[PDB]
Design a protein around this ligand. Structure first.
Ligand SMILES: NS(=O)(=O)c1ccc(CCN/C([SeH])=N/c2ccc(I)cc2)cc1
Ligand SMILES: [Zn+2]
Length: 258
């Protein structure tokens, strides 16, 4: 009886195996745009993905991960609210059964159709498993998806999903350039938070971009053909794999922009 996103094992149940679910710095949160304060001391983000080395795509039963070679400083996030160098390890998405829901973060209680998470770990901790034990271990770059025009840089991901329909399937996925998933503006909000799935560790500096990317209805419909189940199990579509907004508690969301 493992955690997931159903009635019997969804987000309102996670606290029984992961008591940190009710902690002081949980994610995601609603971003109240009027309460977020401009912080003129924040730096522009530095997103250096020119040497990124993608390797593989995996259906893990909760989402799909595009995994990178993080054994060297090849794709790094720096600047903004961050001290030091954070290395890209993987990206994944969260999405809905309908275009009106799917994002984890919300903006003035608005839900987007999906949310991209580019996951990075602080190189001062040596690898990912050590970094998730530290309050500044991870930096996750969050990017909203709205349905409209296609995102051409997403289509190579969409077209491999048929080969990883079910939990535990993986496929070669080399030479994918994550720069094709970024919006024009790197304006962001930032706050201290957590992983949004178990183990819900409070190890993340969240950096959420204000500008969403547009994807087509056909692109998101292909996300919704994935399965949570393994091969030869009753089909359960991989939809609504998002955690809802958690209490902000004693936190301030900072804006990089006016
Ligand atoms: N949705 S999210 O962006 O907040 C998000 C949610 C979950 C995760 C993955 C955590 N899995 C862990 Se804790 N894996 C390892 C543990 C030990 C070792 I050694 C290596 C890996 C990342 C990002
Ligand atoms: Zn995520």
């Amino acid at each position: 009886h493992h955690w997931g996103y159903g009635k019997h094992n969804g987000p309102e149940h996670w606290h029984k195996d992961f008591p940190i679910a009710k902690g002081e710095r949980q994610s995601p949160v609603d971003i109240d745009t009027h309460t977020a304060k401009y912080d003129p001391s924040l730096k522009p983000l530095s997103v250096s993905y020119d040497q990124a080395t993608s390797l593989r795509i995996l259906n893990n039963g909760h989402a799909f991960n595009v995994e990178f070679d993080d054994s060297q400083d090849k794709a790094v996030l720096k600047g903004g609210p961050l001290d030091g160098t954070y290395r890209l390890i993987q990206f994944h998405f969260h999405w809905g059964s309908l275009d009106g829901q799917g994002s984890e973060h919300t903006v003035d209680k608005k839900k987007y159709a999906a949310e991209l998470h580019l996951v990075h770990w602080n190189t001062k901790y040596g690898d990912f498993g050590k970094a998730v034990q530290q309050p500044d271990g991870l930096a996750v770059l969050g990017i909203f998806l709205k349905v409209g025009s296609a995102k051409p840089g997403l289509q190579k991901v969409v077209d491999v999903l048929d080969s990883i329909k079910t939990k535990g399937k993986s496929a070669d996925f080399t030479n994918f350039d994550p720069r094709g998933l970024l919006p024009e503006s790197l304006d962001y909000w930032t706050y201290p938070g957590s992983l949004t799935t178990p183990p819900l560790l409070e190890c993340v500096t969240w950096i959420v971009l204000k500008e969403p990317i547009s994807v087509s209805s056909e692109q998101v419909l292909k996300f919704r053909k994935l399965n949570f189940n393994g091969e030869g199990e009753p089909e359960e579509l991989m939809v609504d794999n998002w955690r809802p907004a958690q209490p902000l508690k004693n936190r301030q969301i900072k804006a990089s922009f006016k």
